[PDB]
Design a protein around this ligand. Structure first.
Ligand code: CDL
Ligand code: CDL
Ligand code: CDL
Ligand code: CDL
Ligand code: PLX
Ligand code: PLX
Ligand code: PLX
Ligand code: PEE
Lengths: 55, 140, 53, 459, 104, 56, 70, 347, 122
């Protein structure tokens, strides 16, 4: 119950699961310039409104 | 912007719980809107109405998390008469985590979110108390 | 980063066009020649941090 | 102390310039000579350490560890040449190179005067160990074990690095002598609490602490015999040495920051001793034994008394020798029958009597029979814990029973009963294995004769 | 082929006693084996073990145990002869310690 | 005939030579830490009529 | 015989420790002083360090400019 | 492509970079960027195929957009202060636009999407050039305008770069994409210390360039672009795989290898200011890069994968073209930590 | 941030100012120089290994040139590093001397009059 299941569940298995999920989320892009150029536009507006407005 | 952060922060910890909850709700809504914008840009929803649905879902989830966190943090701080105590922020973070778990309808997400958000909120309160800087200004 | 090749060789590759008050053709002056001249002589040789104040 | 460091760096090209069939002889002879040379560090003072230079120093706590490392290298060499006979010459030289580099890193780690240099060497020890485990291990789990061995360490050590440099930007020095003399109390703030955690967690995960120990069974089971020897006998003592060193700057926070770790250490010592009672793998039993003994050492270091430090030092030395002997004894049977299950080869006392005597002596020493140094360390730690709190004598006492049980259990499972009928490939014990057992066991009783050599600086 | 890959079979283990009834377990070559045994036994038992134990047993007293015993004997004799207490609760002379002026 | 003997067993002097080199380097390190030689309050001493330094 | 053949007296180790301690203490004090000096120099900009470039005054043309008022 | 034409194009790329590096006029820096892009576009399409054309088109679009933002920032700075010299960037909006344009040119997150695609679409030599030489000019400009940077935006982009590099590289079986994600993470590391010390930025860039050059030369020597084709090299030349494994360990930042020196130093620098949380998070995140380097080392050097029969023929031939700078690059990539203080020569 | 690029009197691309000639040159037996030579020897060995030549005995002229080049560059590298650190200490001491109010020397207090709290370990 403790050594083979829960101590494994909390520290290493959770870390591996989270890293795998985030890797799948990040690397799964279709390679279409339309989508991430739209994202570039969003990023530029966010940068001018969040950081630039506060000087 | 920092206007929402200041509007949340200028209120004392254990005073005016409704205003603190409102400010937290505003911050959560802004975060959800930004997340929805990026998600729609990178993962097109194939339909305008489905895009509005996804934006509303994300925004409501984030706003609910923020409102619950703010309300419970303020209520605990004022009930215990113990401001500047990280335990109130821990309780608020776990309440927000349980809200997220209920929103996604998953016990594992709820428990993990409660634990991690409680630790993160306690750490944020500790940093506010001790003066920890996330983006340090260059000094040397 | 910045390799001051011009300073080492004394070449003046692009410094003739950096400022408004620098030896224009036919000695035509800029609208703010005196102001920029005064600012430049004020801030010379003391560093950017000091010159900002 | 370059008179010890340079001969190892000379062991390197001597191994790489040796004739194809003379590598083992040269390596063993010169490693034994280096151990004889390192024997001179036991002549310590009563007040301060041996400050050889601005970089290296020797203390009454690090000299026994250095002697144990230099003595363990030849034993690994003898224990490795059996299962590496079919290997090519270049890969054999690479294996010996890994062993020599590990010894060099450990020697420099145990004598560094600087905490960042100590961190660099104590982290450099990972690469040869990881390469050995993941390249010369036998089963397919080894790869996973390597990962478990790596990140578990690094996640504990990377915060420490940050803390270390932070300290150097506050006090101006990380030299151990200046740190000791210019020591100042730690206040009670959240920043100090997290600095304490950053300074402690690396050595607590290298012990390993109960709950953070999951890497150890994998690493000590899938490793080759030399890898298991060095992992159990020396590499676990890095955490103890580092905690004994770093605790000088953590007072008086430890006074109340030790409670969760003390609770974990005691209850997990009981838990791992109980786990040893139901183990189908013979190597895993020894690994969990190591976990229990290191939990005792953690308690001794955490309660911060002179008797506790003396007992902890004695226990580290005794555990290193005993666990290395137990791993070699298990590896003999594994090489005979190619299986790690404890109930596979039974009744081996009938077939191998002298091996049964070696097993009996190793098991008697494991359960801390008087007047062995195992008992001396355990009893000193128990007396210190009793002074700390009278109720501890319950838990400690519990452990004392359970250990004995599982210890004799192993013996009764492997040596007594009746031999398995279908196993007919059990050849007589070679002179090499008997010599390995004797060279493990004789120093133990010889140190029992003169126990003040392993009692540390608090003596 | 109903197979997955071309591979050698797993070979049987070699018994060192077959070609060398007195094999010492060190090497397949009898001469290198015998000399490995000889060097191990000579440099492990004869040189390091016995001579190292003799060297450790006769290490000079750098811990100053005998010196401390003699110093304690001197001090005990003096303090008992002149009637002073055998030990003092203060290890430092109060004359060189300056307490803070005000305790209120 | 010693040619083959040497070319086979010349690897046996690397470790002893390293030992002597390490001793020499330890002495060289010792010679750079003499700023307080015969200057400590506990061991400050008058020189003998012949000797030049209290320790090397 | 062992002490005469293999070891020295305690004064050698004593004074070597003295020298090592002096060197390390001086290094620590120098490190702290350098950190303070860096902080002050970056804050004020009145030292040799953190000197950022400014327009050279030698580029200005001090000539009549076809207009009396520049 | 003609060898003379290829040499001219390569020299024009380097000339654009040098023009960026030696100029004091914003117009000349912009011209250097334009010339570098113009000469770089054909180099990516040296081997003509649809993937190379797609990579060139994506690179051209990204860099042209970045250069237009660059010129607009220059013009705004001129409007609010009639200065052309590269200096403290007297206007904040212009500085935000400059930071965004230079981040887009470098591939910093969230303008990182083009880097893996362009690296995967071109040959190994072109990828080497793109991932090593093309980082000098924007980083030089950033170093020159470092005193006026907004630390919040720069540090946010650096942290995002490290996180995204680790997470994206976790999912790759193609070696070029792995290199691109490693590059993104290392650019994050380089730009995290830029507001505090540019000498640390230069040191990190030099060590990264050395390690990347060694890695790419080892990948060209053993003609592998996927993990499985690299798993065959042990049966043809094991020394190359062993050197590759040690180089991967150095890239993972393990002591006592030289790849440990940059991060270490950066951490120390970031601890001289207060900045405690960010380096801890940064090391925690670099553990991901170390993880997938370790996975590559498992696949190529520490275990033996099955081979093919035709490999026997390859046993009978030697490598014809020989890279003269590979051994020095490997040695500098690995055994350089003891010479750490020599970094004082950088400032 | 850049500490020493804008330091007055700095020649752009010198790599070794004349003031550096006022410092003692590194000894030719310097351990850092020996390590640089070791790096050159390792580079030669790796070159031999990659080309599939006898690693230790293949090319002696190439190995000797490797060692010579590494030592030759390391000598000047060490000279420049020592010059840079001497410059740093020079500027530090000058700044401390020119700002006495920012670096006061307060009265020394002995341990007999400093009240240090005692924390029992029990
Ligand atoms: C100084 C430097 C700065 C410079 C920048 C500033 C410049 C300012 C000047 C602007 C001047 C205007 C110039 C015109 C530009 C030309 C655009 C163009 O060519 O169109 C190409 C592009 C594609 O052309 P196409 O392929 O031929 O058409 C295919 C279909 O469109 C799509 O095919 P489909 O049906 O299969 O796809 C489904 C559908 C799906 O459609 C959707 O999903 C949209 C539904 C989202 C709901 C909106 C939120 C509602 C509530 C939020 C309110 C916030 C405040 C209140 C807070 C809470 C209140 C309680 O479409 C999409 O998926 C496309 C996604 C793009 C949506 C808009 C992009 C903006 C960023 C994404 C944000 C997403 C919303 C999240 C919330 C953000 C904050 C509002 O057209 C479009 O994407 C839609 C029309 C765009 C016209 C108006 C948009 C202009 C915006 C200007 C800047 C603002
Ligand atoms: C190094 C040393 C060793 C350390 C390591 C080892 C030890 C630690 C690790 C092991 C334990 C940690 C596990 C954490 C929870 C795991 C949940 C999970 O896996 O989700 C995935 C998994 C996937 O679910 P799913 O696929 O999404 O949905 C299908 C369901 O399975 C289908 O579900 P269902 O239809 O069968 O029924 C679901 C329903 C109904 O459940 C049932 O049907 C059966 C009834 C179970 C309810 C349990 C509570 C009632 C009785 C408790 C009485 C007192 C507790 C003991 C305290 C002693 C005080 C003297 O349950 C609920 O609705 C949950 C709502 C909340 C009620 C329970 C939460 C109580 C929190 C404890 C408060 C303690 C405060 C401090 C006390 C200090 C004094 C000591 O979820 C589950 O299936 C498990 C459901 C039950 C979870 C609640 C159990 C609580 C256990 C104690 C928590 C405290 C420890 C953690 C501390 C950190 C928190 C800040
Ligand atoms: C085969 C092994 C298989 C494997 C097993 C594992 C083995 C592993 C081994 C590893 C290596 C081990 C190395 C360890 C090194 C340790 C050496 C050492 O430190 O020496 C210390 C110690 C020497 O002390 P010391 O500090 O050097 O001397 C200081 C004084 O200045 C001296 O005082 P002194 O001025 O009076 O001179 C005394 C002198 C001369 O004194 C005398 O001659 C007088 C004696 C009295 C006789 C007087 C009457 C007899 C004659 C009368 C009739 C003839 C005279 C008249 C003629 C007419 C006939 C009527 O005699 C001696 O010096 C003592 C003998 C030296 C022995 C040294 C041991 C070296 C061991 C290293 C090799 C290890 C391998 C073993 C090989 C050894 C050989 C087999 O050696 C001893 O062992 C002494 C023990 C004898 C005391 C009596 C026992 C008392 C028992 C009471 C307890 C009862 C409870 C039950 C327990 C029973 C247990 C016995
Ligand atoms: C810290 C303190 C100081 C230590 C510094 C660091 C360590 C030493 C420096 C490292 C670099 C130096 C050597 C690099 C080039 C060697 C490349 C090579 O392939 O070697 C093979 C070569 C044998 O080839 P061969 O003789 O032509 O004929 C056999 C066939 O080639 C048959 O060959 P094959 O190709 O068919 O065999 C295939 C084999 C071929 O693969 C290999 O050979 C592996 C070599 C890896 C190269 C290392 C990468 C770069 C260096 C970074 C090291 C990191 C160290 C930091 C700690 C982390 C540990 C990794 O691949 C495998 O079997 C795969 C097995 C996987 C094992 C995984 C471990 C690999 C990496 C471990 C590196 C450990 C350090 C280097 C160990 C020594 C290597 C010779 O080895 C040698 O003979 C050279 C070694 C001895 C030369 C020096 C002799 C000195 C002269 C004697 C007098 C002494 C003077 C004293 C002065 C006082 C007056 C008396
Ligand atoms: C799997 C095994 C891994 C190893 C486990 C390591 C154990 C680490 C545990 C850390 C020990 C103590 C941490 C902090 C010290 C006190 C803890 C706290 O409960 O005490 C009170 C703290 O009060 C409240 O508890 C506030 C803290 C509540 C928020 C903390 C989150 C706890 C949730 C537990 C999650 C599990 C953590 C481990 C994750 C793996 C004391 O009151 P207070 O005087 O005010 O604080 C003292 C500090 N002052 C003086 C500066 C003010
Ligand atoms: C095969 C069958 C065997 C059975 C038959 C055997 C026959 C008899 C042999 C057994 C001997 C019985 C032992 C009886 C005790 C006598 C020896 C004892 O007296 O010697 C001690 C001396 O013991 C030694 O000090 C201990 C030996 C040191 C152990 C080092 C081991 C060698 C190093 C190898 C590597 C170490 C690895 C572990 C890392 C620490 C005395 O200690 P001490 O009170 O002082 O002496 C005072 C007088 N002095 C100082 C002038 C000498
Ligand atoms: C992984 C190892 C990295 C090694 C990096 C490459 C090493 C080989 C390259 C050889 C360099 C040749 C240059 C020598 C010709 C003279 C050129 C000289 O004039 O350049 C000076 C500059 O000198 C160079 O900086 C010194 C180069 C030395 C770099 C090596 C240090 C690497 C860190 C320590 C690791 C150990 C390295 C081992 C070396 C083999 C000009 O200074 P300055 O114009 O005013 O600065 C411009 C930039 N500023 C203003 C923004 C600061
Ligand atoms: C394999 C699992 C092992 C787990 C290892 C991780 C445990 C280590 C605990 C985290 C250490 C992070 C702190 C880094 C070093 C601290 C050094 C320090 O003293 O800095 C403090 C500041 O301390 C901090 O900033 C720390 C904040 C925490 C940020 C990172 C959180 C990491 C996770 C925390 C929870 C986990 C801790 C317990 C884990 C137990 C083991 C699982 C002082 O800064 P100042 O600004 O100068 O303060 C006075 C002036 N204002």
């Amino acid at each position: 119950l403790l050594d083979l299941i829960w101590l494994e569940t909390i520290l290493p298995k959770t870390t591996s699961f989270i890293q795998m999920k985030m890797s799948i989320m990040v690397s799964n892009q279709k390679g279409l310039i339309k989508l991430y150029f739209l994202s570039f536009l969003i990023t530029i507006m966010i940068s001018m409104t969040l950081f630039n407005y506060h000087e | 912007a920092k206007t929402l952060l200041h509007k949340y922060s200028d209120i004392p910890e254990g005073t005016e719980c409704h205003r603190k909850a409102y400010a937290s709700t505003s911050i959560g809504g802004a975060t959800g809107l930004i997340v929805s914008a990026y998600s729609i840009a990178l993962k097109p929803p194939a339909s305008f109405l489905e895009g509005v649905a996804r934006t509303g879902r994300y925004t409501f989830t984030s706003a609910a998390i923020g409102a619950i966190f703010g309300l419970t943090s303020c209520i605990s701080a004022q009930v215990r008469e113990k401001p500047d105590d990280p335990l109130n922020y821990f309780i608020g973070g776990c309440a927000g985590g349980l809200t997220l778990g209920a929103r996604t309808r998953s016990y594992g997400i709820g428990a993990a979110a409660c634990a991690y958000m409680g630790l993160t909120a306690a750490l944020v309160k500790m940093g506010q108390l001790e003066g920890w800087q996330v983006f340090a200004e260059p000094k040397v | 980063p910045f390799f001051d090749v011009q300073k080492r060789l004394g070449l003046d590759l692009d410094r003739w066009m950096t400022i408004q008050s620098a030896e224009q053709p036919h000695k035509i002056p800029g609208r703010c020649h005196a102001f920029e001249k005064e600012w430049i002589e004020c801030a010379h040789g003391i560093g950017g941090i000091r010159a900002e104040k | 102390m370059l008179k010890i460091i340079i001969p190892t760096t000379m062991l390197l090209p001597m191994t790489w310039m040796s004739k194809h069939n003379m590598i083992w002889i040269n390596a063993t002879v010169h490693s034994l000579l280096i151990s004889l040379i390192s024997l001179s560090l036991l002549n310590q003072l009563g007040e301060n350490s041996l400050n050889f230079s601005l970089t290296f120093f020797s203390d009454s706590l690090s000299a026994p560890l250095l002697v144990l490392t230099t003595w363990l290298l030849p034993l690994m060499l003898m224990a490795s040449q059996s299962h590496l006979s079919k290997e090519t010459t270049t890969r054999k030289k690479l294996y010996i190179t890994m062993l020599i580099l590990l010894q060099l890193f450990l020697i420099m780690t145990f004598t560094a005067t600087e905490l960042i240099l100590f961190y660099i060497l104590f982290e450099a020890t990972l690469v040869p160990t990881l390469i050995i485990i993941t390249r010369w291990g036998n089963q397919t789990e080894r790869l996973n074990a390597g990962l478990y061995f790596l990140f578990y360490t690094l996640a504990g050590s990377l915060p420490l690095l940050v803390a270390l440099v932070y300290i150097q930007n506050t006090t101006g020095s990380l030299n151990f002598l200046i740190i000791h003399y210019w020591s100042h109390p730690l206040s009670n703030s959240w920043s100090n609490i997290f600095m304490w955690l950053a300074c402690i967690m690396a050595f607590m995960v290298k012990m390993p602490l109960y709950g953070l120990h999951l890497w150890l069974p994998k690493a000590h089971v899938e490793a080759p015999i030399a890898g298991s020897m060095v992992l159990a006998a020396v590499l676990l003592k890095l955490g103890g040495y580092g905690m004994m060193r770093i605790t000088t700057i953590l007072n008086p926070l430890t006074n109340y920051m030790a409670y969760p770790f003390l609770m974990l250490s005691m209850w997990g010592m009981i838990m791992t001793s109980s786990i040893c009672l139901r183990q189908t793998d013979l190597k895993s039993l020894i690994a969990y034994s190591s976990v229990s003994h290191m939990a005792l050492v953690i308690v001794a270091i955490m309660i911060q008394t002179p008797w506790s430090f003396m007992g902890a030092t004695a226990l580290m030395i005794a555990h290193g020798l005993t666990s290395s002997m137990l791993f070699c004894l298990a590896n003999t049977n594994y090489e005979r029958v190619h299986s790690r299950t404890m109930i596979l080869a039974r009744g081996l006392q009938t077939l191998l009597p002298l091996m049964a005597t070696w097993w009996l002596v190793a098991s008697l020493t494991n359960l801390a029979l008087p007047p062995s140094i195992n008992l001396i360390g355990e009893l000193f730690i128990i007396t210190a814990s009793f002074s700390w709190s009278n109720i501890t004598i319950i838990l400690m006492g519990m452990n004392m029973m359970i250990t004995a049980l599982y210890s004799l259990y192993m013996l009764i499972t492997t040596q007594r009963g009746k031999y398995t009928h279908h196993i007919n490939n059990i050849k007589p014990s070679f002179t090499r294995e008997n010599a390995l057992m004797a060279l493990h066991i004789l120093p133990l009783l010889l140190l029992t004769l003169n126990p003040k050599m392993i009692l540390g600086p608090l003596y | 082929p109903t197979i997955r890959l071309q591979e050698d079979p797993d070979p049987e283990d070699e018994n060192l006693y077959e070609k060398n009834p007195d094999s010492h377990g060190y090497d397949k070559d009898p001469i290198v084996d015998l000399w490995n045994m000889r060097v191990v036994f000579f440099f492990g038992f004869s040189i390091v073990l016995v001579l190292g134990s003799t060297f450790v047993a006769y290490l000079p007293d750098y811990r100053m145990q005998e010196w401390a015993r003699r110093e304690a004997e001197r001090l005990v004799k003096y303090r008992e002869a002149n009637g002073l207490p055998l030990m003092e609760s203060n290890c430092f002379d109060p004359n060189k310690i300056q307490l803070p002026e005000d305790e209120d | 005939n010693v040619l083959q003997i040497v070319r086979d067993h010349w690897v046996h002097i690397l470790v002893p030579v390293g030992f002597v080199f390490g001793c020499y380097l330890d002495r060289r390190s010792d010679e750079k830490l003499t700023a307080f030689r015969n200057k400590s309050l506990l061991f400050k001493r008058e020189l003998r009529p012949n000797e030049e330094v209290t320790w090397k | 015989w062992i002490a005469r053949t293999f070891y020295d007296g305690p004064e050698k180790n004593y004074e070597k420790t003295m020298a090592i301690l002096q060197i390390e203490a001086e290094k620590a004090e120098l490190r702290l002083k350098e950190l303070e000096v860096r902080r002050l120099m970056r804050a004020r900009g009145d030292g040799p360090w953190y000197q950022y470039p400014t327009i050279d005054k030698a580029l200005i043309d001090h000539s009549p400019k076809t207009t009396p008022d520049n | 492509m003609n060898p003379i034409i290829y040499t001219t194009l390569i020299m024009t790329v380097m000339s654009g970079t040098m023009l960026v590096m030696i100029s004091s006029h914003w117009l000349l820096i912009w011209i250097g960027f334009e010339m570098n892009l113009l000469a770089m576009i054909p180099v990516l399409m040296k081997n003509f195929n649809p993937r190379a054309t797609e990579a060139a088109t994506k690179y051209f679009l990204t860099q042209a957009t970045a250069s237009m933002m660059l010129m607009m920032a220059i013009i705004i700075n001129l409007l609010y202060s009639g200065q052309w010299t590269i200096t403290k960037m007297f206007n904040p909006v212009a500085m935000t636009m400059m930071t965004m344009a230079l981040a887009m040119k470098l591939g910093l997150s969230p303008f990182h999407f083009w880097v893996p695609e362009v690296t995967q679409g071109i040959s190994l030599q072109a990828g080497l050039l793109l991932l090593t030489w093309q980082k000098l000019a924007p980083l030089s400009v950033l170093c020159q305008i470092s005193q006026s940077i907004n630390p919040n935006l720069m540090l946010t982009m650096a942290m995002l770069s490290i996180l995204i590099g680790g997470w994206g590289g976790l999912n790759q079986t193609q070696l070029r994409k792995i290199m691109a994600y490693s590059s993104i993470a290392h650019m994050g590391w380089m730009t995290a210390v830029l507001p505090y010390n540019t000498t640390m930025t230069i040191l990190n860039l030099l060590i990264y360039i050395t390690m990347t050059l060694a890695m790419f030369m080892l990948l060209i020597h053993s003609s592998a672009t996927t993990t499985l084709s690299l798993s065959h090299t042990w049966n043809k030349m094991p020394v190359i795989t062993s050197l590759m494994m040690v180089t991967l360990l150095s890239m993972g930042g393990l002591p006592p290898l030289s790849g440990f020196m940059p991060k270490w130093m950066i951490i120390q620098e970031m601890t001289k200011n207060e900045s405690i949380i960010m380096p801890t998070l940064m090391a925690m995140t670099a553990l991901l890069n170390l993880y997938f380097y370790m996975r590559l080392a498992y696949s190529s050097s520490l275990t033996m994968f099955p081979s093919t029969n035709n490999m026997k023929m390859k046993w009978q031939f030697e490598h014809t073209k020989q890279m003269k700078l590979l051994p020095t690059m490997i040695v500098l990539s690995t055994l350089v930590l003891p010479m750490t203080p020599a970094l004082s020569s950088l400032n | 941030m850049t500490m020493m690029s804008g330091r007055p009197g700095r020649v752009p691309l010198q790599f070794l100012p004349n003031e550096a000639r006022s410092l003692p040159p590194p000894k030719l037996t310097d351990p850092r120089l020996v390590y640089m030579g070791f790096l050159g020897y390792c580079s030669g060995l790796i070159d031999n290994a990659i080309r599939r030549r006898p690693v230790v005995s293949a090319g002696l002229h190439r190995q000797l040139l490797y060692v010579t080049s590494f030592v030759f560059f390391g000598y000047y590298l060490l000279k420049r590093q020592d010059y840079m650190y001497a410059l740093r200490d020079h500027d530090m001491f000058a700044y401390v001397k020119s700002h006495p109010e920012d670096f006061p020397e307060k009265d020394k207090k002995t341990y007999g009059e400093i009240l240090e709290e005692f924390h029992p370990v029990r």
